[PDB]
Amino acid sequence: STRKAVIGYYFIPTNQINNYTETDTSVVPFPVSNITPAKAKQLTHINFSFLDINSNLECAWDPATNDAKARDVVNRLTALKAHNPSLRIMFSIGGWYYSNDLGVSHANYVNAVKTPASRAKFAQSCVRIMKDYGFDGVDINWEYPQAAEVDGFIAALQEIRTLLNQQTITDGRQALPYQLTIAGAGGAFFLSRYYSKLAQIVAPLDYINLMTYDLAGPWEKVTNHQAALFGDAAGPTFYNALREANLGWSWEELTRAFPSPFSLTVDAAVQQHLMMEGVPSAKIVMGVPFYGRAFKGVSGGNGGQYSSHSTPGEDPYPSTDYWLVGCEECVRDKDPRIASYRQLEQMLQGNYGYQRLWNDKTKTPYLYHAQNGLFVTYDDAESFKYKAKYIKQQQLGGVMFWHLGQDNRNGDLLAALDRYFNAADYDDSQLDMGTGLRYTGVGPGNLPIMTAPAYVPGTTYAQGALVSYQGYVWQTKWGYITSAPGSDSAWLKVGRVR
Amino acid sequence: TRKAVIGYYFIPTNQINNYTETDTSVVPFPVSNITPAKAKQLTHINFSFLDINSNLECAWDPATNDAKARDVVNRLTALKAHNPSLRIMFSIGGWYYSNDLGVSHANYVNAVKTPASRAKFAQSCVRIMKDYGFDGVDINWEYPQAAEVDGFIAALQEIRTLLNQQTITDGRQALPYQLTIAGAGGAFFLSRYYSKLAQIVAPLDYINLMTYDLAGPWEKVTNHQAALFGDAAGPTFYNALREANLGWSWEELTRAFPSPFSLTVDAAVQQHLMMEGVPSAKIVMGVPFYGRAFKGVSGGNGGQYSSHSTPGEDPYPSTDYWLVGCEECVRDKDPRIASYRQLEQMLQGNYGYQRLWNDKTKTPYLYHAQNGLFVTYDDAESFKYKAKYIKQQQLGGVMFWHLGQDNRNGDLLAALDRYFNAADYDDSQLDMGTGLRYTGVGPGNLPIMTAPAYVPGTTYAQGALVSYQGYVWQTKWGYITSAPGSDSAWLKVGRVR
C-alpha cells in the first residue's frame, strides 16, 4: 504494498491570500505555482491551513479574508488534482494561533463540541465549507482539547464522519471518498490531555497526523533536536507526563508503560500511540518539520547540543536583535528563532561560518555556529531517509510535514520523501538505523504473547512468578499467594495467552 | 472525650463447654479474673468468637453447649454493674473461622452476596445481640476479597440501620448499640478493600486496626510484630497500596505510597488517615497481649533481623517445644506464641532470656543467647509511646488482642487505662524518638497551606502554587494554561489556609 501517505500542510497567512501574487516572493514567498505537475504527483494530500470556528460555532474563514482571493488560492491547489488522481486537497481547522488555550478563537472550539445540537451544526458547516470551496476532506488541528472536552470532541469527529460518508455516496465519490483526519500532539505534555481516549478519537479518522516536531525549542532550558528520531543519552530528559493521564492504571502499569524521565523523540511519540489498544499503525502518519529552530548563547564542546542558551522564548520576539547570521527571512518575519529549510539551505551556501553537523544517534542534522554561539535544529533529506525507513518498518500510514511553503524552490524535501517510499532506484535495505535509544514502555493495551504454567490454587509463588490464568499471563509483585490472578492487587498482567 | 479501651476476649468452644472459674488448667483466664477495678479500665469487651453457619446466619459454634455459653456471656454482662460505659460486644469471624482457608469461610462469602442474604444475616446479627445480651457487633472477617467488598459494605449499612432502629426501640440513647470491624494493620491485606475505606468506615463507630502480627515465623527475617516506628536496620516491604484501584495518577500514588517502607503501627495509622472520609476519631490502634517466638536466630543484634528456622505452617508441625520455660506452649502445643503472662514468668524464671529494647521501634524483645531464640512482644513500656501516639494523632482509642493473655494483676490493661486517664501520670516529656515515620501523604490528610487564588487566563510556570475550590494546587511541569481539576498538570498538595 500500500502506497504511503505523503501529507503536506500548506500554510498561507490571511494577508498573503488578500494580496496573493505568484510573481513577487517578497509578498507571497511560496506561491502555489511552485507546485508543478511533477510535485503534485509526489503528494497524496495537501492540508490547506487554516480555517477557523467562529462565534456562531460554525467552520469559517477568518473574517478578514477576501473571499474572492481565497477561492482562487484554493482553486490553484485543487487544479493540481488534474495531475494526480490520488491527490486530495483537505482544509485544516485550527492551528496554534487560532486554537491554543489562549488563542483568538479557543472558546469557539470548546463550545462547538458541547452538545448534539452544536456538534450537528458544526459538522454540517464543515461539510458545507468543504463543498462550497472544493475541498476533498477535513483535518482538525485543535491544540488541544482537554480531559473534560474530549468526549465532545470525539462525538464531533463521529458526526463529521457520518456526514462525510453520506456526502460521498450522495456525490458518487466512492472512488475518492471524502476524508477526515486530525493533527495530534507528538510531545507527552499535551498528549496527556486526551491520551486515555486515543482509540475513540482515532476510530472515525482515516489518519492521525502526529506532530513529531517542536519537541525542543527556545522555551526549554537545554538546546536539543526538535525532532530526534531516537534518543541520545547525552541529551536532556523530561518527566513523562502520560503518567498523569486519567488512565485508571496501577503504579506498576504506569511506570512500565511510561519510563521517566525519557527522551522526547519521534520514536517515543509513535510508540506511545501504538502502545494504546485500538490505535492501528496504518492510521498513524509521522510528521516531520520543513523548518528549524535556532538558539543563541550556546556553549561549545558538543556542537552546541545539549547546552544552556540565552534565547527569548516568548511570542512575539521582543528584541530587534536578529542574530541568526545570514537569515534575511528572519528579518522579514522579525524572529531569528525559526527559519525555513529554504532559508537554512541558503545560509550554508552563504559561507556564513556554519558547520553542518550530524548526530548519528538521533539521526538528525544540526548547525553549529562557533563564533556567535548559535545552534540550529532542523531536518533534511538525510534525516528523512531514517524516518522513511522507520515508517516502513513500523508499518505506519505515511508521513506528514509542516509545511510545504518552507521547502526549497526545487522542492527537494518533498521529492526526498516521495523518493524514499516510491523510487525504484532508491534502496534503503542496508540503511543502518543506529544505536540511538528506543522507547521501552509496555502497556496493558500492547501485551506480548507469553507462556506460563496455568495458575494452581494452593500454590505459593511471588516475586516474579509467572502464571497463565483466564487468557493472560500474570506476574507476582509481592507477598505470596491466596489470590487468583486478578482477584487482588498482587498480580500484574504482563502478557497474553494464545 | 474518653479514649476507647477495647479488649477482645477469646475463649475457645472447649473452654465454654468445660467452663470453670476454678482451674487454671481448664480455663486459663475465666471471667472472675475481671474484677470491678479491671471492668472500670475497659470501655468494651469483644467476646470472641461467634461465627457464621451454613444457614448463613450469625451463630455460636455448633459444638457449643448453650447453657455454658449463656452463663459465660452473663458473667461478662454482669460486669456492667461496675462500669456504666462498658459494652460487651461480640465479634464474628476471627482467623480460624473466616480466613480464606478457614473452616467456615464459604459462609462469610455467601452471607453478604445478596440483599436477601444480607438482610437475613444483618437480622441474625441483631437477634443474636438481643438474645444473648450483647451491646454491639464487631465483624472480624479476614478478609473480604476485593470483589466481595461491595456486598460487605452494603451489609454493614444494613446492620447499622437495624442497630440504630434497635437503639431507639430499647431507649439506649445513653449507650447506643455499636458496630465495629477489625481492620487489617498491614498493607498487603489492607489493599483488598483499601480503595473503599470511606464506605467501610461510614457505618462504623470504630475500625479496630490489627496493628500486630506485622512480623512472624512466616516471614524470612525476624522482626518486631508491632513496631511503632521504623528501624533502618530492619526489613522493608513492598507497598501494596500503590497497586490499589484508587484511580490516582503516578505522582499521587508515589507521594502517598513510598516503597519499600517499614511495616509499622505508625504506617497503618497514617495509611488510613490518608483516605478522605476516614476520621481519626474512628481509628482504634490495636496492640498485642502476646509475643511471637523464632528459633535458629543469629546473634549480633539481639536476634533482630536474622534468618531463622521456625516453621510457619498453621498447626505447629512437631512436638519439639523449643521455647524454653514456656509451659503454655507445651499445653497448647506451639512454641511460636506466648501470652504476656507466660513471657513474664519466663523472664522471672531465669531461663536464659535477656529483655532488650529497641529505641527506634519503641518495643521490647527477648533474646536467648544460649538456644538462639528471639521473641517480639509488647509491654507497659511500649504502651507508653503507643498511648501518646494515640493522643497526638487524635485517634479513638486502643484495642487489644486479647484480654485472656494479660497477667493476673492485669498490668497491661491497667497501663493502657493509666496512660489515658490517671491524673498522676504525665507523658508530656515522653520523647517519641527518631524511628522512621511513614512519609506518605494523601487526599485525606493534606497539610494546611496558603496560596494565591487561581486566576483564569494566567499561564503558570512549573512549581507554581495556587488555591482553587478549597485546595492548594502545584503545577507538575511548565506553561500551564488551564485550571486545577481541569488540567492534569496540577497536583493537589495542600488544603484551606
Side-chain angles (χ1 to χ4, degrees), chain A residues 2-103 105-220 222-497, chain B residues 1-112 114-219 221-496:
Chain A
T2 311
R3 185 186 182 173
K4 294 298 181 191
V6 177
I7 300 174
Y9 278 85
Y10 177 65
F11 173 64
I12 182 179
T14 300
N15 43 43
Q16 282 186 33
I17 289 180
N18 293 346
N19 293 289
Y20 191 75
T21 169
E22 311 202 306
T23 64
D24 188 343
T25 57
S26 73
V27 179
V28 174
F30 198 99
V32 179
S33 54
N34 277 15
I35 308 179
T36 58
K39 303 185 190 174
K41 296 187 186 72
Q42 294 168 350
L43 291 147
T44 60
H45 301 68
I46 289 178
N47 295 340
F48 173 82
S49 308
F50 287 109
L51 268 273
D52 197 9
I53 303 192
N54 63 25
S55 67
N56 201 41
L57 306 183
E58 291 184 300
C59 177
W61 290 82
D62 174 324
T65 312
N66 182 103
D67 193 62
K69 296 291 278 172
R71 304 177 175 265
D72 178 70
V73 168
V74 175
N75 294 336
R76 284 167 198 285
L77 293 168
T78 57
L80 298 175
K81 294 159 66 175
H83 311 290
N84 181 349
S86 287
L87 180 64
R88 284 184 178 81
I89 304 305
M90 314 275 277
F91 64 105
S92 187
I93 311 166
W96 180 261
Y97 181 71
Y98 297 151
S99 81
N100 78 83
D101 285 4
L102 291 170
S105 304
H106 181 261
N108 302 341
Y109 294 70
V110 172
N111 293 321
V113 305
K114 272 181 180 171
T115 66
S118 64
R119 293 192 289 272
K121 182 178 187 172
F122 173 59
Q124 285 165 47
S125 69
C126 288
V127 173
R128 166 168 50 69
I129 286 290
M130 183 186 83
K131 292 304 311 281
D132 192 26
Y133 294 84
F135 291 115
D136 302 303
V138 177
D139 180 66
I140 311 294
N141 186 197
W142 171 358
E143 312 194 295
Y144 301 83
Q146 70 186 307
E149 299 151 7
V150 181
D151 287 345
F153 176 66
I154 288 154
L157 294 171
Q158 305 168 327
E159 180 80 310
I160 293 176
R161 168 50 69 181
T162 296
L163 303 190
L164 288 177
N165 284 3
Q166 179 50 60
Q167 196 59 43
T168 289
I169 297 178
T170 293
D171 291 342
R173 276 283 288 270
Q174 285 90 173
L176 193 70
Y178 294 118
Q179 288 187 332
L180 170 66
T181 63
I182 73 173
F189 300 107
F190 282 114
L191 178 56
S192 72
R193 295 184 167 195
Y194 62 83
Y195 184 71
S196 78
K197 293 175 181 161
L198 269 173
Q200 293 176 251
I201 290 162
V202 176
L205 313 181
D206 284 286
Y207 303 105
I208 177 170
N209 296 135
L210 300 195
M211 298 180 277
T212 32
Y213 40 76
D214 284 353
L215 300 183
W219 62 86
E220 299 304 333
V222 182
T223 63
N224 187 27
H225 298 286
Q226 69 155 156
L229 173 51
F230 300 116
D232 184 355
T237 52
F238 304 66
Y239 178 72
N240 195 325
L242 300 183
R243 287 177 163 190
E244 301 300 297
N246 173 44
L247 287 167
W249 300 355
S250 77
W251 189 93
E252 295 282 2
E253 300 185 312
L254 291 163
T255 303
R256 282 171 53 86
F258 314 121
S260 176
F262 76 118
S263 295
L264 216 39
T265 68
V266 174
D267 169 72
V270 176
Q271 291 315 303
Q272 288 164 346
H273 278 70
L274 293 173
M275 197 164 298
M276 293 294 298
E277 184 162 53
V279 180
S281 67
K283 287 192 167 184
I284 295 173
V285 172
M286 170 196 297
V288 302
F290 273 29
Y291 62 90
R293 292 188 174 288
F295 303 64
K296 74 177 190 180
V298 311
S299 306
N302 196 29
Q305 311 174 89
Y306 324 138
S307 128
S308 43
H309 65 94
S310 63
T311 315
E314 49 192 296
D315 283 55
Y317 187 69
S319 172
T320 174
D321 182 16
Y322 306 135
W323 46 258
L324 194 63
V325 176
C327 183
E328 310 193 320
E329 188 184 72
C330 300
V331 177
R332 170 188 193 280
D333 301 334
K334 304 190 174 306
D335 202 335
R337 293 170 308 183
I338 181 255
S340 63
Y341 171 76
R342 186 163 71 260
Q343 175 67 90
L344 294 176
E345 195 172 61
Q346 293 177 180
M347 283 147 69
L348 284 171
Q349 295 168 176
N351 211 40
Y352 292 108
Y354 288 105
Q355 299 171 52
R356 193 274 192 177
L357 298 175
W358 177 265
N359 184 305
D360 215 38
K361 290 293 189 178
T362 64
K363 294 300 179 177
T364 52
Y366 62 103
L367 303 188
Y368 173 52
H369 194 295
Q371 258 175 179
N372 301 50
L374 305 183
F375 177 75
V376 182
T377 167
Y378 71 110
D379 269 76
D380 69 359
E382 185 175 356
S383 66
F384 285 178
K385 290 189 181 177
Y386 298 94
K387 289 168 172 179
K389 176 156 188 173
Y390 185 88
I391 286 163
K392 292 169 204 183
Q393 290 182 143
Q394 288 300 293
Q395 305 190 76
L396 309 187
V399 65
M400 169 274 272
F401 58 89
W402 179 275
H403 73 94
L404 186 49
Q406 294 168 153
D407 200 351
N408 66 20
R409 299 299 181 184
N410 244 288
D412 293 335
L413 297 191
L414 165 63
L417 289 174
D418 175 63
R419 171 176 307 119
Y420 307 153
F421 296 126
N422 308 303
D425 55 7
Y426 174 73
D427 167 27
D428 63 17
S429 59
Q430 309 304 315
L431 184 70
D432 164 54
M433 301 293 286
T435 56
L437 308 174
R438 269 59 171 170
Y439 186 72
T440 62
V442 290
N446 65 313
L447 298 190
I449 281 294
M450 285 185 75
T451 300
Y455 169 52
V456 176
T459 293
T460 299
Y461 308 92
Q463 204 58 112
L466 295 163
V467 307
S468 56
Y469 190 70
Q470 314 188 325
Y472 295 85
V473 169
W474 307 78
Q475 180 169 49
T476 52
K477 301 166 195 174
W478 70 66
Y480 290 112
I481 73 303
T482 74
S483 60
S487 75
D488 56 15
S489 303
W491 297 90
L492 184 67
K493 190 185 280 182
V494 292
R496 297 172 293 138
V497 174
Chain B
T1 300
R2 184 187 179 167
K3 295 303 184 185
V5 173
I6 307 183
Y8 277 85
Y9 173 68
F10 173 72
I11 173 180
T13 311
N14 45 62
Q15 280 182 47
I16 287 290
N17 294 344
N18 300 72
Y19 193 74
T20 172
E21 296 278 3
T22 65
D23 194 340
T24 175
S25 77
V26 180
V27 180
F29 199 100
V31 182
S32 60
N33 277 278
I34 311 173
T35 55
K38 302 189 187 179
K40 287 163 188 290
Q41 300 172 340
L42 290 150
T43 64
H44 300 69
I45 292 179
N46 286 353
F47 173 87
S48 313
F49 281 110
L50 261 64
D51 178 24
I52 296 193
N53 62 26
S54 58
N55 281 321
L56 304 191
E57 303 180 296
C58 167
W60 289 78
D61 187 49
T64 316
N65 106 64
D66 209 43
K68 284 292 212 299
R70 291 169 183 283
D71 187 63
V72 171
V73 170
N74 290 350
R75 288 173 193 278
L76 282 170
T77 58
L79 300 171
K80 290 193 289 177
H82 308 297
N83 176 2
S85 298
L86 183 63
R87 282 181 179 89
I88 305 306
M89 315 272 280
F90 68 95
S91 184
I92 308 170
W95 181 263
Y96 181 57
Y97 297 145
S98 76
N99 76 90
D100 296 351
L101 313 181
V103 301
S104 310
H105 186 248
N107 306 329
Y108 291 71
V109 180
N110 290 322
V112 312
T114 73
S117 64
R118 291 194 284 278
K120 185 189 307 72
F121 173 62
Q123 295 175 58
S124 49
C125 283
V126 182
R127 278 207 307 289
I128 286 290
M129 189 183 76
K130 293 308 304 294
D131 201 353
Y132 288 77
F134 292 119
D135 301 307
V137 178
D138 180 61
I139 302 185
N140 183 201
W141 172 6
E142 326 191 273
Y143 299 82
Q145 298 284 358
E148 321 178 320
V149 178
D150 290 346
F152 176 67
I153 288 178
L156 294 166
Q157 281 165 168
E158 280 311 296
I159 289 166
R160 165 52 62 181
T161 289
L162 297 186
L163 290 180
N164 276 2
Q165 291 176 4
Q166 201 62 48
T167 290
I168 286 122
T169 300
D170 300 351
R172 284 282 283 259
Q173 294 86 344
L175 192 72
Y177 295 118
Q178 299 189 325
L179 171 61
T180 58
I181 71 167
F188 299 106
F189 284 108
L190 178 57
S191 68
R192 287 185 185 198
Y193 58 84
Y194 188 69
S195 67
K196 293 156 180 181
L197 257 188
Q199 289 179 259
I200 288 181
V201 174
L204 311 183
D205 283 283
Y206 303 106
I207 171 162
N208 298 145
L209 301 191
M210 300 180 272
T211 31
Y212 40 74
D213 284 1
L214 301 182
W218 57 87
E219 272 298 333
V221 323
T222 57
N223 189 195
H224 298 276
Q225 69 158 153
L228 179 53
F229 296 120
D231 186 349
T236 55
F237 298 78
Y238 185 103
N239 200 325
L241 300 183
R242 78 181 188 183
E243 298 294 294
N245 190 27
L246 293 157
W248 298 358
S249 77
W250 193 92
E251 280 295 340
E252 305 182 300
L253 293 173
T254 304
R255 300 173 71 94
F257 313 115
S259 182
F261 75 115
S262 295
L263 205 51
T264 62
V265 178
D266 163 63
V269 175
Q270 298 308 308
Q271 288 165 352
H272 280 75
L273 290 171
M274 290 201 292
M275 291 294 275
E276 288 173 285
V278 181
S280 70
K282 285 186 175 185
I283 300 172
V284 170
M285 173 201 294
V287 298
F289 273 26
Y290 58 93
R292 285 185 176 290
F294 303 68
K295 73 164 179 68
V297 306
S298 310
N301 195 21
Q304 304 175 96
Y305 321 137
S306 161
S307 49
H308 63 98
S309 64
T310 315
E313 283 77 19
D314 201 309
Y316 178 68
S318 164
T319 38
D320 177 16
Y321 308 138
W322 45 257
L323 189 57
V324 182
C326 176
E327 303 180 348
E328 296 186 326
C329 301
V330 167
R331 198 255 188 190
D332 302 319
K333 296 164 185 175
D334 193 333
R336 306 170 299 183
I337 287 290
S339 65
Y340 173 76
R341 183 169 68 256
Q342 177 59 91
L343 294 177
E344 192 171 59
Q345 297 175 195
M346 287 167 43
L347 264 181
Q348 45 190 57
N350 305 301
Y351 288 105
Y353 293 106
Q354 296 177 55
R355 175 190 179 281
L356 294 180
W357 174 264
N358 184 302
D359 211 43
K360 289 282 190 176
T361 61
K362 296 298 182 174
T363 51
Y365 57 106
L366 305 187
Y367 176 54
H368 193 280
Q370 196 173 322
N371 298 199
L373 313 172
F374 170 77
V375 187
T376 166
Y377 71 113
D378 271 79
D379 66 1
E381 253 285 300
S382 65
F383 286 177
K384 292 191 172 183
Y385 300 93
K386 288 175 175 181
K388 179 166 182 169
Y389 184 94
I390 282 163
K391 298 171 195 182
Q392 297 177 319
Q393 299 295 315
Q394 300 191 284
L395 304 186
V398 67
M399 164 279 272
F400 57 85
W401 180 273
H402 74 88
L403 225 211
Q405 303 173 319
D406 201 348
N407 65 12
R408 300 301 171 182
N409 271 157
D411 290 337
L412 296 185
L413 172 55
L416 288 175
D417 171 70
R418 172 175 310 116
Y419 307 151
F420 293 135
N421 303 305
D424 52 10
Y425 172 71
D426 171 12
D427 63 14
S428 63
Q429 312 187 327
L430 188 68
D431 168 56
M432 303 290 281
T434 52
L436 306 170
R437 270 57 166 182
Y438 184 75
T439 65
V441 183
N445 66 147
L446 291 174
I448 276 177
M449 301 182 124
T450 57
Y454 170 77
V455 178
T458 294
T459 301
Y460 295 96
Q462 162 173 31
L465 304 153
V466 305
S467 60
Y468 199 72
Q469 306 173 300
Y471 302 110
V472 172
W473 312 72
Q474 179 170 61
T475 54
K476 305 166 197 170
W477 56 80
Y479 303 99
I480 307 312
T481 55
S482 210
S486 295
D487 194 330
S488 298
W490 294 101
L491 175 71
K492 194 193 300 301
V493 299
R495 77 178 193 305
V496 195

